[PDB]
Amino acid sequence: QFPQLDPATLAAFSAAFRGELIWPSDADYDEARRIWNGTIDRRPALIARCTSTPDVVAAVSFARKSGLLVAVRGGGHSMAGHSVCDGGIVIDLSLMNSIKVSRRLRRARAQGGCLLGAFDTATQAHMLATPAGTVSHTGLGGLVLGGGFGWLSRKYGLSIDNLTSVEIVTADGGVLTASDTENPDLFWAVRGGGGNFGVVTAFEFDLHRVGPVRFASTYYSLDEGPQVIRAWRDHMATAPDELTWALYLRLAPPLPELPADMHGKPVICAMSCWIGDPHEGERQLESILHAGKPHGLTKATLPYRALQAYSFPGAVVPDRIYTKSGYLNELSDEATDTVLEHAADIASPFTQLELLYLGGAVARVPDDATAYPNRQSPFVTNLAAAWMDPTEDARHTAWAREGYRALAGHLSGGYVNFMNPGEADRTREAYGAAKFERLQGVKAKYDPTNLFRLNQNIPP
Ligand SMILES: Cc1cc2nc3c(=O)[nH]c(=O)nc-3n(C[C@H](O)[C@H](O)[C@H](O)COP(=O)(O)OP(=O)(O)OC[C@H]3O[C@@H](n4cnc5c(N)ncnc54)[C@H](O)[C@@H]3O)c2cc1C
Numbered sequence: 001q002f003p004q005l006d007p008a009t010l011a012a013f014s015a016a017f018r019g020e021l022i023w024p025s026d027a028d029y030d031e032a033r034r035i036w037n038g039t040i041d042r043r044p045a046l047i048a049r050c051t052s053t054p055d056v057v058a059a060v061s062f063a064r065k066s067g068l069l070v071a072v073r074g075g076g077h078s079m080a081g082h083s084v085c086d087g088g089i090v091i092d093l094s095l096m097n098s099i100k101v102s103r104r105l106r107r108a109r110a111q112g113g114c115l116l117g118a119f120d121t122a123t124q125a126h127m128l129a130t131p132a133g134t135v136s137h138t139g140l141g142g143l144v145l146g147g148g149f150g151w152l153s154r155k156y157g158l159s160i161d162n163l164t165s166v167e168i169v170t171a172d173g174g175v176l177t178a179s180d181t182e183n184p185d186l187f188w189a190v191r192g193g194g195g196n197f198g199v200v201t202a203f204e205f206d207l208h209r210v211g212p213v214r215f216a217s218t219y220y221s222l223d224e225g226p227q228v229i230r231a232w233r234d235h236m237a238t239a240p241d242e243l244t245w246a247l248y249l250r251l252a253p254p255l256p257e258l259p260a261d262m263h264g265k266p267v268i269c270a271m272s273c274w275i276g277d278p279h280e281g282e283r284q285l286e287s288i289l290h291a292g293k294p295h296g297l298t299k300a301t302l303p304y305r306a307l308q309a310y311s312f313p314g315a316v317v318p319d320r321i322y323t324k325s326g327y328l329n330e331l332s333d334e335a336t337d338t339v340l341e342h343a344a345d346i347a348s349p350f351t352q353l354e355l356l357y358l359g360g361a362v363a364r365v366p367d368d369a370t371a372y373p374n375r376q377s378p379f380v381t382n383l384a385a386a387w388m389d390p391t392e393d394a395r396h397t398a399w400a401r402e403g404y405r406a407l408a409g410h411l412s413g414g415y416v417n418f419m420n421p422g423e424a425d426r427t428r429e430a431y432g433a434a435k436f437e438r439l440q441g442v443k444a445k446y447d448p449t450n451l452f453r454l455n456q457n458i459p460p
Pocket of ligand 1: 035036071072073074075076077078079081082083093112113132133134135137138139140141142143144145146147148149150194195196198199200201417418454455456
């Protein structure tokens, strides 16, 4: 964290850098190096809080010339801890939060450090939206470059399926535009290939009109686990794009809507919504709400921005997390039973075994159209352990590991944006031989020195 820096190279950097630099001796250094995954404790030599594209140019070129290991940071939610490093530079984008929306053209230009909630707020000023993740403080930058799915995804695709161009700062310090008509090889790679190919300082999106959303959440006893998941699995195979339905197995929150008898016990929290007319959605949601007997049932007509802000109503921000995720082509009765066995052993009130159904518009993009793999797998299982006590790491990590291992045989692929710090190994398997090979050629061209290796890495 104290390498010798050449005063010449450093001087040129600050002359060209209009941002704020955070050094290990500064008082805000310890807070600035913390990311969402609180198990990641790392001490960069320097934190560069970039405020503009020229700032990112200055920082990238200062890292290349100085040979510093490069962490790039959007919203900080890397479950692998990629957005902070030991001994290098954090290229921090969090201050680059500015959005422009044209309601007439249904387009949004968003800087590379935006949080989802800032994006959704800006577009919803005009009743517009585009798919993103379900938790507002997730960074738009990392989420999009991995694909990005959420409430709107079954209707309007992944985030990358609404992305029309990017401004990206490559390792040599140049600034490029990547679109379907300009460096289209790089535009294929950034739509699914992570931060491997440069620092995206601006995303441009197509927008869709999204009015009020009929929404429901409820909790089921696990005694009805088998019926519920089986009805969930069977129904989403032929469900319309407009219905999104998700299962979150977890300890029941000690909330008033819920009988105190269920507090602190493993339950299925089913959340659903209808991206369409709210009268149709009311009928549609009631059709899928009694696969089991629903407790703490809350139904609401929400502005889309409120739906985006809903997940999840927790009492405490979890400090420590560990993830194991994977896709499934099918969810058999045998996998359902294993999912239910391991859900019953959930110990922390912050931990969720998530069961998602993508499909819809996601699965109708041709496989090779983006670098995002597994479009044809509809199911996503995510063993998402979360806790507070650093002395309980082993217990919560062991729950996700053994849950993943008993589901291994059914798992068919992995989402790069759910990889944990010990899963660099999984990269080529995750993308598949054909996609990986094309990504390596784009890397060889755009980042031959692998300047950007703090990601699900693709070596050139
Ligand atoms: C609580 C939580 C909820 C989530 N919900 C969803 C969800 O609903 N749907 C979904 O699809 N995913 C979801 N994710 C996963 C999310 O997409 C990834 O964790 C993503 O990497 C987070 O982006 P970030 O910028 O916040 O993370 P960071 O730690 O800042 O960055 C993650 C990676 O992206 C790179 N990166 C970030 N910004 C840029 C940029 N501008 N240019 C180049 N590289 C960049 C970083 O170098 C790093 O490798 C969730 C994650 C968390 C922790």
